[PDB]
Design a protein around this ligand. Structure first.
Ligand code: HEM
Length: 153
């Protein structure tokens, strides 16, 4: 559970993300792929990218970074009243894409790194503790949709 003070820090720094939603989701995916090469395998269209500046040249990489932030944006703007937005995602991500909850922790960490790296002052300790709590409850709620279907996470 997040206070409304906290939801505001969360959604106010997310507004920035949204000024450059590609730039961010790109950097996120790079951070995740470069840091966890295992994740790269779930996207057959980029599984071949081998270097950094190389994947920075990918339109579809950007296209996906723009996707994952846009949806997470939508979820964040629900302030946890986001079941009608996480039912489909948990299920797609557990079954179709076969993504474990460990990989979600990974991208949660990439996001946070990117926020810190793109907005240092605006994203201080208490703004970060807020962001961390949101992504954590996002993750816990997916985790339970995973479990309801017999996936573990
Ligand atoms: C913030 C956490 C995440 C969010 C909000 C997110 C969001 C989305 C959305 C909105 C889609 C659209 C397609 C669908 O749902 O059927 C999608 C698809 C997909 N997601 Fe995620 N995702 C997250 C984490 C991950 C991670 C960590 C991976 C892999 C390591 C992943 C792999 C995929 C793949 C492979 C697809 C299919 C894309 C394609 O088929 O071209 N997702 N995701």
């Amino acid at each position: 559970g997040l206070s409304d003070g906290e939801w505001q820090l969360v959604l106010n720094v997310w507004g920035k993300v949204e000024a450059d939603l590609a730039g961010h989701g790109q950097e996120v995916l790079i951070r995740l792929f470069k840091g966890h090469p295992e994740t790269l395998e779930k996207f057959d269209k980029f599984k071949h990218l081998k270097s950094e500046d190389e994947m920075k040249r990918s339109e579809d990489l950007k296209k996906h970074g723009n996707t994952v932030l846009t949806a997470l944006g939508g979820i964040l703007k629900k302030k946890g009243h986001h079941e009608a937005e996480l039912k489909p995602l948990a299920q797609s991500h557990a079954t179709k894409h076969k993504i474990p909850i460990k990989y979600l922790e990974f991208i949660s960490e990439a996001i946070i790194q990117v926020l810190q790296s793109k907005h240092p002052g605006d994203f201080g300790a208490d703004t970060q503790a807020a962001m961390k709590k949101a992504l954590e409850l996002f993750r816990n709620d997916i985790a339970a949709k995973y479990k309801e279907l017999g996936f573990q996470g």
